[PDB]
Amino acid sequence: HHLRVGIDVGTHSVGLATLRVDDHGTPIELLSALSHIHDLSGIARRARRLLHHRRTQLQQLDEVLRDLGFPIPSMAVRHIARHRGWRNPYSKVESLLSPAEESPFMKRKICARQGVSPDVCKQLLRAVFKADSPRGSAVSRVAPDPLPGQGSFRRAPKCDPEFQRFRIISIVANLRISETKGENRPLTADERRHVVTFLTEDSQADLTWVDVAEKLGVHRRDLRGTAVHTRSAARPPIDATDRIMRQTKISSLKTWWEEADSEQRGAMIRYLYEDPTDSECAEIIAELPEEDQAKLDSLHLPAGRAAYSRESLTALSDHMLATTDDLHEARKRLFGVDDSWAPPAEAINAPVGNPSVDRTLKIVGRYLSAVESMWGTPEVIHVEHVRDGFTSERMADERDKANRRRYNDNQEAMKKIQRDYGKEGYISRGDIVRLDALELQGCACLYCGTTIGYHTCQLDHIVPQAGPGSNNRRGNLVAVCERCNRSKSNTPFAVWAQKCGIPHVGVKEAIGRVRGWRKQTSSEDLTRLKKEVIARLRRTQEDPEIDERSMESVAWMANELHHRIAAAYPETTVMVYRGSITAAARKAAGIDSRINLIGEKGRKDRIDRRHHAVDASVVALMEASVAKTLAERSSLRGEQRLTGKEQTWKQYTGSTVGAREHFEMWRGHMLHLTELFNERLAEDKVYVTQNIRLRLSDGNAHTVNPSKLVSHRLGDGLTVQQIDRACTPALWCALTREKDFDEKNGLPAREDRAIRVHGHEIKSSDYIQVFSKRKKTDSDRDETPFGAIAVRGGFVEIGPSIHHARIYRVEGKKPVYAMLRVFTHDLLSQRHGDLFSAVIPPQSISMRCAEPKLRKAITTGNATYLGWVVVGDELEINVDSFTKYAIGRFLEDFPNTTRWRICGYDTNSKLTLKPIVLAAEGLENPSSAVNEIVELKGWRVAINVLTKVHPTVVRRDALGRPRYSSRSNLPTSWTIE
Ligand SMILES: [Mg+2]
Ligand SMILES: [Mg+2]
Ligand SMILES: [Mg+2]
Ligand SMILES: [Zn+2]
């Protein structure tokens, strides 16, 4: 039984698919296919938690002082002030550097000080000397180091520079050198230091193992162990934290890191990640707001929790660098564990403190569990990662905008070439790069210095690439005279220079020319370019051949995801590819326009959300030989764009009979897959799912200034509408219990009225307070109630803070459907109970804001509670009757749109609905109605008219299948009837 799982990670979605193939890889059954749709800062929240806890600790200190015969606000108040101020918020000691909570002393004239032996109460008291200050991480819970002897140290976050260094060293410690066969030796300590120093020189370099081989002075073929597991590293490792810090859009942070103290780099990373307890930062941080702002939450440090503490990480690191041990041997020697000892891996869904990542990880974890339970262990789990991408909606938006920018800069470059050279027709990337290089190089051949121009110069790849294609990055391309290009042939520059004997051709001369480069109009980009070019001008070995791992993602989160999945499914082959693989595959197998998705196709961006399920299905079917061939076709294409010639890359399907046969077979499989997928679409079993929130939203909020309450003299009488806006439920009870309260006319004017609210007597001559949104100079006599709560200084609205809606049928000859929106506030007292059956009493703000007819029906026992919905819930709706207004016209353009998602409660009797299958971004010049329904307001429909067509509230399990019953008490589907 061959099961292949595919996962397509997007910015806002995850496509998921399970495929059964036979012994020769032909897809025979598409078992599952679906699209799961998703939907201050950490630094200052940690700061605030810290502030409150410390504060209460200072209060405890005052408690100690008062009861110690000291006054909280002449020697006595002096001692008070000294101990409070000059110590308690100062944390001076902090002597021998300890996070050990409690802390031993280890150690006129007569008036001060002592004591003598006592008042160590005071010393122990200074915020209890932070014993124990923290309730939250990194104390609870950051799990302890599991190595024997290390159990008092907390495990380090993977973003810690010490972890990054450990990882690099560990990988280097797996490398072998072959000097004769078969006589592998590990790298010596000196070699290890040399390679580690090299890999940490520039975290922004894009190196291959060939670069490492050259640094070691060995042929690439003689360097081994690059593919050994600690997944193995296809490319040499870098410090991912340092790279992120040097590439961040937060200017002053980058600047700081640049000149930072190294120990201070570590301390800073710890601060930004989880420890709100340094002085230097945030004394470093506070500067330059807006950068301090939501920008700081945009900083995406490498995720994950290391298996070991910093202490262990550095001990293991130093040992591996100074010897020839690998990690396994290192751990045995340093800590004495046996050969079977292994640290556990984080669970797939273990939180990384990043909302998008975390939602993705929960989805993947539960899908893989459901797949295994239902069908058995998969042979492969293939993932496609998104791009850049997968950090936030924010960073995705920004990168998209900057991509439209770069697109425009390229279009301008094309225009300028057409203008300046009169080039009609296709303007290749070769044309653009050649002109750019000519200008950069001041019209001189990089290799021999001779004058060249647009007619005479040619573009060269400095370093050739073994096998089909070349490395086509700008840093491997230079403008060159015809003579040097012809002489150099297929040789790396440095090798050719050593033997060509042409005047002014050499490595040093060429480097010199490169150092001479200046911007023709981004200096960072240029500096990077120059470093890349200089490095390539030194190279004496070819770039390595394209292989099955050329398409593998090298993003941190991709490696971490690979690690968690492989550890959770040890018998399964796991791969995480970059987010271009499925588009490449779909083009090569020619299957866009074969899938029967909604959309003109017309691509552009696919409007049908089921496309993520297509991409997951395709990635499930990917295979090593095919990945290699696709990477090659792409490289060949890059090459032929540089020569601007007749493109033949589409005809390349491999260099051996075996590769070409695999590729053709795979194209056959892709054809089968489109048949199975179309058939599944026709059964309507390609699902679109989304989670619903069942728990109460907690805290956060605030940040809100109160509106003013309005005062009414009780004795002047009150209308029903004024009473319904009473500033507290208790006041509402007291007003409506009056013997002369009238359901229509409210309370009449009376001079002898006396009511009781919380023990307090309120008389006719007193004033009560109501919520109002009107000026105090206008009448609120007919103002209807709205969701509000009293707070300090007045009230705030609780607009969309609604937890669920309960649907009722008001019984009668003409039955009427209505809903009660239950505000989150009204469930706080019954938090840990059944939220959907908690009592919502007449005096509650929820009831008082419901339709009067529903209120009256509930109070008289004429309302039948059908069931509950929440925002995010799916509705299946017969839409035949809806041919009027905006919804009718929308339906003209997208007929039989029957699956809808509840987006909100437009009013106390209307739901806002948007279609589930359709993506706003895929719209191309929409009619105003379509834009209104999909993109803007959504379909706003009265509960009574909606319910008359008997829609079904659809609830789905982890495989996206409708759930009609549950022995686990999970929410189930139900028809509103
Ligand atoms: Mg050449
Ligand atoms: Mg080649
Ligand atoms: Mg994708
Ligand atoms: Zn030349």
From Swiss-Prot:
The keyword Hydrolase applies. Residues 550-698 are annotated as: RuvC-III. Zn(2+) binds at C445, C448, C481, C484. Residues 347-392 are annotated as: RuvC-II. Binds 2 Mg(2+) per subunit. Pfam families: Cas9_a, Cas9_b_hairpin, Cas9_C, Cas9_Topo, HNH, RuvC_III. Keywords: Antiviral defense, DNA-binding, Endonuclease, Hydrolase, Magnesium, Manganese, Metal-binding, Nuclease, RNA-binding, Zinc. InterPro entries: Cas9, Cas9_alpha-helical_lobe, Cas9_b_hairpin, Cas9_C, Cas9_Topo, HNH, HNH_CAS9, HNH_nuc. The keyword RNA-binding applies. Residues 1-39 are annotated as: RuvC-I. The simplicity of the Cas9-gRNAs RNA-directed DNA endonuclease activity may be used to target and modify a DNA sequence of interest. Mn(2+) 2 binds at D8, E384. GO terms for biological process: defense response to virus. Mg(2+) 1 binds at D460, N485. Its EC number is 3.1.-.-. Belongs to the CRISPR-associated protein Cas9 family. Subtype II-C subfamily. This is CRISPR-associated endonuclease Cas9. It comes from Actinomyces naeslundii (strain ATCC 12104 / DSM 43013 / CCUG 2238 / JCM 8349 / NCTC 10301 / Howell 279).
